[PDB]
């Protein structure tokens, strides 16, 4: 599948694997039969056990085979990256041994069930069942080395970083312990050691940052002097759609000659020739212009102690990577200050009200005391809403006293007339 693989079912060390599959067939299947039963129930008993152990080992083997990434079918970076970190031939030898063993176990189960429908005694049938599961055990005992390898690869691939070969990347290179660890330290949130020796870093550390509203990933590298740790860096340069930031130490530090950095830059030149290189400086000055003889290079002088030029290197890197009627506003809002969360002196929100009053789901918010009225003595509203079959809100208007008195006039205009006799 995609970038990373943490989600793999664990690999039992071939002795415990036996203790899982065989114990499960002892616990999950019926275990007690008399010799005095019918032969048909004796047959069906031991058949059920051979088959169930068959499905047992196969289930565990299938989990390994489907779980591990199909090395030559994933991605050219990952096909080669796993080839650098692990002996790719042995990685395919190990998984071939599991694929072999699963087909073996399938063959054993299919054999002994077919052989089992001809058993004449409980003893013969028992000897055949013991033969079957013992044979499966022998197959799994022959897997003590590849499964010990598969557990170690599972653990170490489970902790590998997830680089995206389709997002905007930028490799960070140079000699081991130039000061590029301080660069990624001061560009993003990733803890990389700046310990004063050669190979401090042993793998590709990743740092994410955001500029011009976009997802970037700068990949720290161990460095080039060939080793598995060293070749990891070179293949990261080769297979990633990236720009390479080769770092140089124009100082007494690093413990390596600057001329050796020149020799290494021009030697590794072919595989980063397509990548639009940036070079950052952290007779003699003339041999920096010898580095400048490369078609695509730029030279910049910076200091990691200050936080401005480290940002400016990033700016030029990202720039290289992209090319590769009136509204109504009340003055009560305009005059209002901003909400500073770490301020000792501000207004208390309802969030802090409910905490001070205790609990989230226990505090009942008073809908009253928050609405505007003429007299705040009648704030605690009762409001009848219903009187005798007819709801109050339908009768409720202003000037109902004057409207009532109009109907009072309409009383006396019918009072003296003589409708009530």
């Amino acid at each position: 599948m995609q970038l990373s693989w943490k989600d793999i079912p664990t690999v039992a060390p071939a002795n415990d694997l036996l203790d899982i599959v065989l114990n499960r067939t002892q616990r999950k299947t019926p275990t007690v039969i008399r010799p005095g039963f019918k032969i048909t129930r004796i047959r069906a008993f031991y058949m059920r056990k051979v088959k169930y152990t068959g499905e047992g080992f196969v289930e565990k083997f299938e989990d390994i085979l489907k779980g591990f990434p199909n090395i030559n079918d994933v991605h050219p970076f990952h096909r080669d990256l796993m080839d650098t970190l692990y002996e790719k031939n042995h990685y395919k030898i190990s998984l071939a041994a599991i694929s072999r063993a699963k087909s073996l176990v399938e063959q054993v189960a299919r054999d002994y069930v077919r052989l089992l429908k001809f058993g004449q005694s409980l003893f013969q049938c028992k000897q055949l069942k013991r033969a079957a599961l013992g044979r499966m055990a022998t197959i799994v005992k022959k897997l003590r080395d590849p499964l010990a390898y598969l557990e170690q690869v599972r653990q170490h691939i489970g902790r590998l970083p997830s680089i995206d070969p389709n997002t905007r990347t930028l490799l960070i290179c140079g000699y081991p312990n130039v000061g590029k660890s301080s660069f990624l330290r001061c560009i993003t949130k990733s803890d990389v050691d700046v310990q004063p020796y050669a190979f401090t870093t042993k793998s590709l550390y990743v740092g994410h940052f955001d500029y011009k509203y976009l997802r970037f990933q700068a990949i720290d590298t161990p460095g080039i002097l060939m080793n598995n740790i060293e070749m990891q860096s070179i293949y990261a340069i080769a297979h990633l759609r990236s720009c390479v930031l080769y770092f140089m130490d124009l100082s007494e530090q690093c413990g390596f000659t600057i001329e050796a950095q020149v020799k290494l830059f021009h030697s590794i030149k072919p595989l980063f020739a397509n990548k639009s290189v940036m070079v950052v400086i952290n007779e003699r000055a003339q041999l920096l212009e010898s580095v400048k003889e490369v078609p695509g290079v730029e030279i910049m002088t910076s200091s990691c102690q200050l936080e401005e030029n480290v940002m400016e290197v990033r700016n030029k890197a990202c720039e290289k990577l992209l090319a590769s009627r009136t509204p109504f506003i009340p003055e009560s809002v305009k005059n209002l200050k901003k909400y500073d969360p770490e301020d000792p002196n501000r207004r208390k929100l309802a969030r802090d009200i409910e905490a001070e009053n205790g609990g989230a789901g226990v505090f009942n918010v008073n809908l009253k005391d928050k609405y505007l009225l003429e007299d705040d003595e009648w704030k605690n509203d009762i409001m009848p809403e219903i009187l005798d079959g007819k709801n109050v809100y339908d009768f409720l208007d202003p000037e109902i006293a004057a409207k009532l008195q109009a109907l009072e006039e309409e009383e006396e205009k019918l009072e003296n007339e003589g409708f009530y006799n």
Binding site: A360, N364, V365, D388
Partner: protein
């Protein structure tokens, strides 16, 4: 079914007795622990719900409540129990010297044929400075780890055609046994009101003999119903008053009406006295005597702590269909009729 509710047999009496009581604190004031009435009624209430965290916070909920009729219980005795390795053991009961016609009726199965000569020699046993009564009351106060109150119901103030009141035993959860037996001494021949035992927003456990369905046919055939059931955690919504008109009036409705529906409840009369409006459905049917105990323990969740703001009481006709709250609203909507004019 449920194997706990076995044997699934007919109860000993309609008045089921309360099996357990709320514990005891020996610093609390003297107060009754269980009350009794007569369950008869069921009705609909709306209320706004101040239950925070819910989907119905500051919304309105309609719900079914039951009206138990509870006339003021009258104290006619006290029982003292010693703590034994065999359980409890009643050593002395004491009575009220002059008891009603109702309880002297409870002492006979055939009331009319008798000379009504129940407590004649017991009242004549009182007839002096006390001397023996105070001796038995000393006997209770000296020993007897728990003290229970003998009461009875006011059957005549209830519309029931039974005339025969029920005796009961109610323990006291007020500390110092001295104050128990002396509360009783202050309460012979006197009556106890409902709201002196309960109030609003209080959880109770109403116990009742469950509506007999007779013979019925491992899922076994036999008797269905008439079992003594205890149901716990029914919230009291309203305690009412007989003399007070506008019991059906809420903070919102405020129309002068009694919770009694038009033409009363079905198969049972009106209400002419104190009542408890309990939420949900209490076991038993109408006309059934229920005994209301209180909670056994501190049962506070937010279903027990919240305040009920009753908005409206449905007093429409349960016998038939409901269209009018008052008789006044029937002939207000109707206009005037034939026999009127």
């Amino acid at each position: 079914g449920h194997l706990g509710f076995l044997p699934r047999k007919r109860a000993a009496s309609i008045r089921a007795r309360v099996k357990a009581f709320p514990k005891d604190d020996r610093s609390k004031p003297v107060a009754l622990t269980s009350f009794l009435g007569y369950k008869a009624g069921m009705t609909t209430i709306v209320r706004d719900l101040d239950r925070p965290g819910s989907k119905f916070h500051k919304r309105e909920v309609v719900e079914a409540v039951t009206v138990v009729d509870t006339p003021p219980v009258v104290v006619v005795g006290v029982v003292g129990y010693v703590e034994t390795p065999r359980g409890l053991r009643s050593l002395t009961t004491v009575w009220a010297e002059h008891l009603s016609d109702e309880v002297k009726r409870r002492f006979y199965k055939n009331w009319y044929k008798s000379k009504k000569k129940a407590f004649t020699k017991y009242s004549a046993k009182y007839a002096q400075d006390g001397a023996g009564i105070e001796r038995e009351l000393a006997r209770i106060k000296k020993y007897a780890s728990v003290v229970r109150v003998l009461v009875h119901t006011q059957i005549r103030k209830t519309p029931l055609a039974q005339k025969k009141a029920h005796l009961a035993e109610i323990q006291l959860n007020g500390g110092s046994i001295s104050e128990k037996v002396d509360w009783a001494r202050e309460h012979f021949e006197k009556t106890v009101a409902v709201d002196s035992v309960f109030e609003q927003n209080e959880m109770i456990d109403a116990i009742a003999v469950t509506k007999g369905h007779g013979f019925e046919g491992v899922a076994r055939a036999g008797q269905r119903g008439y079992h003594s059931r205890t149901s716990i955690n029914h919230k009291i919504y309203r305690v009412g008053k007989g003399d007070d008109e506008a019991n059906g009036a809420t903070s919102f409705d405020r129309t002068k009406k009694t919770i009694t529906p038009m033409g009363g409840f079905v198969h049972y009369g009106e209400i002419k006295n104190d009542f408890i409006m309990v939420k949900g459905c209490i076991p038993g049917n109408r006309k059934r005597i229920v005994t209301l105990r209180k909670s056994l323990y501190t049962n506070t969740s937010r279903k027990a702590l919240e305040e009920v703001s009753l908005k409206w009481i449905d007093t429409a006709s349960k016998f038939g269909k409901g269209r009018f709250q008052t008789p006044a609203e029937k002939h207000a909507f109707m206009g005037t009729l034939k026999k009127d004019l």
